[PDB]
Design a protein around this ligand. Sequence first.
Ligand SMILES: COC1=NC(=O)C(c2cc(C(C)(C)C)c(OC)c3cc(-c4ccc(NS(C)(=O)=O)cc4)cnc23)=CC1
Ligand SMILES: [Zn+2]
Length: 546
Amino acid sequence: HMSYTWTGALITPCAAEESKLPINALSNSLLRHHNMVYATTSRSAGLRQKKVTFDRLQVLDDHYRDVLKEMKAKASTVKAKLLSVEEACKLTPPHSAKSKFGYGAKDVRNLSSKAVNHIHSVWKDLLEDTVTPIDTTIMAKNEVFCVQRKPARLIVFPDLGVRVCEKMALYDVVSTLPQVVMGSSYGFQYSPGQRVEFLVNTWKSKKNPMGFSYDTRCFDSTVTENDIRVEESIYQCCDLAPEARQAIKSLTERLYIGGPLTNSKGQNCGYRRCRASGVLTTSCGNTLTCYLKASAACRAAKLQDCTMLVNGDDLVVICESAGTQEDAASLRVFTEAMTRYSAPPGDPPQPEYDLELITSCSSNVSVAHDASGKRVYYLTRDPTTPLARAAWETARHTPVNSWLGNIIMYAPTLWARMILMTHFFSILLAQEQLEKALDCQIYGACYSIEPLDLPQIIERLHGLSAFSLHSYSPGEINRVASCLRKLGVPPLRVWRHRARSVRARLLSQGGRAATCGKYLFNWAVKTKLKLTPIFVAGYSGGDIYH
Ligand SMILES: COC1=NC(=O)C(c2cc(C(C)(C)C)c(OC)c3cc(-c4ccc(NS(C)(=O)=O)cc4)cnc23)=CC1
Ligand SMILES: [Zn+2]
C-alpha cells in the first residue's frame, strides 16, 4: 500500500520558471535581503517525490467505527443538489488549467458549445463507467518562501472537463456536509473574527484549559484507499439524486482512490494511491478524515472535554488539563493512535497553557486594544511568508494576489496594516489600478475583489475595531520587528511615515479612495477621525470561484 509508485519520468513545467526573487524599482522600499526570498520549481520535484513516497499501515479500532457511525448518522440528515452544467461552469476559476480537449476555463465560464459538449460526454462516461482510472496531471507548485529551502509541493489534478463534473456531483455536498457532520468543529465556516470568538469561548469554557495543534507529516500522502472509501460512504448517506450517487461512486473508484500520474509533456510519471491535491473533495475529504481520526484518537487518549477545530489537515483541540506530565503522556497516546490510523506527525504536538501560544493554520490568537481601550482578541501570524510573497508580487503579476488575501484575512494585525496596506496602496495609486478588480485566494477559493471595497470587506470580517486597534502585545511586536530585521524590511516608523503620504494621496482622490485612506490609514495620522459603518466552506485544490 505505497502512497506513490514511480516510473522515472520527471515532473515537467509548462512555461518559464523563476527561483530567484525578481527585482524592480519598488523592491528595495519593502525588502533589502533579496537572497532570503526564493520560489519553488519542478527542479526540486524529485526530492518531494522521495518524501511523499511511503508505505501506509492502518489499524482501525472500535473508537474509529464509533466516531464514524456518529458522523454517518449526521451525514444522513444532509440533502444535496445536483448542479447543472451551467451552474458548475460558473463556479470555475477564470485562470484555471485548460482542458487537453481544446477549451479553457474562460471557454467553460462562457458556456461555449465545445466545452459544454465535452462536459456532457465526461458526465455520461462517469455514469456508464465505474472501473477505468481517470488520467491526472502531476505538477510542481510555484510557491514563494523565505530561507529556513523547501522542495516544491505537488499538485495532482484531473482534466478541466472532469472538474466541472465533480462540481455537478459534489459542489453542494462539500459545501453543506462538513458543517452538519462536525458542527462548530468545522472551521472553514468561520470568518477570522468568528474563529477567535469560538476559540476564546472554548478556552474560557474549560476549568483548567489545555490546547494543542496537530501537524500531519504530508497528510495527503497518509490518506489510504480505506479513508477515501470511508469518505464516499459518508457522502452516500446524503439524500442524493441517483445520477449524483453514481457519479460519486465513479469519481471515487476512478479518480479519488488513485490513478495514473501524467506530466505536462504527456509521459507516465507513475501511479497515485492516496489523496489528489487538486480535486473538489480535497478540502472536505481531508477535514472529514482528520476529524474522524482525531475524535477517535481523543477517545483513545481519554482526553477530558475534547473541543476540536478542523480545517482540512490542520487540527486544534482544546480540553481539560491534568498537569503538564499527564498531558504530555495523553498527547503521546494521541500521536500513537493517529499513527495507527495512518496519520503520523512531522513535529509531535506539545501542550499549551496559553491560547496565544497554539499555532492554528500557521496563525495564532493575540491581544491589542480598541478605541475604548477594551482588550480585543484577534488572529495574527508570523509575517515572514506573507512579506516574502509580497516581495514577489512587487515585481511580478501572479494569478493569486497573496498580499490582497493577507490584507483581508489579517486586517487587524500590526504588520498587514502598517506594511502590506501601505506598500500596495502606494503601488495602486502610482499605477491608478485602484478601480481594477484583482483575483486573490481565501480558504483555497478564488475571489475577484475590488481593492477600493477593502474597508467594507474588512468591517464584514473583523468589525470596525480592526481600523481602531492599538497597543499590540510585546511578543507580537517583537516577532514583527525581528522578521523586519531578517528580510531587511524598513522599520515600522518608516511605514507610519509612508502611510501618512498614502492616506494624504487617497483623500485627494475622493470617493472610495477617501474612505480607503480614512478607514485603512487612520492609525497613521496624529489627528484621528471617528470611523463609522460603510463564509460557508474551504475549497483548497477544489477549483472554485465566487
Ligand atoms: C494570502 O491569502 C490568505 N488567504 C487565507 O484564506 C488565509 C487563511 C487564514 C486563516 C485564518 C486563521 C486567518 C482564519 C486560515 O485558517 C482557517 C486559513 C486556512 C487555510 C487552509 C487551507 C488548506 C487546508 N487544508 S487542506 C491542505 O486543503 O487539506 C487547511 C487550511 C487557508 N487559508 C487560511 C491566509 C492568507
Ligand atoms: Zn464504542
